[PDB]
Write a protein that binds this ligand. Structure first.
Ligand code: HEM
Length: 123
């Protein structure tokens, strides 16, 4: 019984990636930063990544290799502003998930830390 299975498995992340990406999609600043006309495959990459990370299927890494996230975000201008907006849509996406307090909190803390860590603009 992993964290993965406990929070609701695959359909929880689908829900989370989906709700996060609607928030991202409708963001004046974040949206033009996702350089795809179609945001479907980006959603998908997130969904899979989160699954894998929390102890679900290793699909992400069998499709793309290692996550090396800080490396993969290297092309992008991720400063305090971009991070804070990313967070706003994650919070909203986590909230809608309506997970039990402790499971919510662990997932949130991770997401917070990871974004804080993703900031890569010497500033
Ligand atoms: C901190 C603010 C962040 C910004 C502005 C940001 C921005 C982006 C952008 C523009 C892309 C490419 C999307 C595309 O393909 O069109 C991307 C990819 C991705 N992001 Fe972030 N990101 C942030 C933080 C995070 C965090 C905290 C996580 C994970 C917990 C994450 C997970 C991913 C993953 C898994 C990909 C695709 C990885 C792959 O290429 O296989 N990002 N991000």
């Amino acid at each position: 019984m992993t964290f993965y299975e406990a929070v609701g498995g695959e359909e929880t992340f689908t829900r989370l990636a989906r709700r996060f990406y609607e928030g991202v999609a409708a963001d004046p600043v974040l949206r033009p930063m996702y350089p795809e006309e179609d945001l479907g495959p980006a959603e998908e990459r997130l969904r899979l990544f989160l699954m894998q990370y929390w102890g679900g299927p290793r699909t992400y890494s069998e499709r793309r290799g290692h996550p090396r996230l800080r490396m993969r975000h290297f092309p992008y201008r991720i400063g305090a502003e971009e991070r804070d907006r990313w967070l706003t849509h994650m919070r909203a996406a986590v909230d809608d998930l309506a997970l039990p307090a402790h499971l919510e909190q662990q997932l949130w803390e991770y997401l917070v830390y990871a974004a804080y860590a993703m900031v890569n603009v010497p500033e």
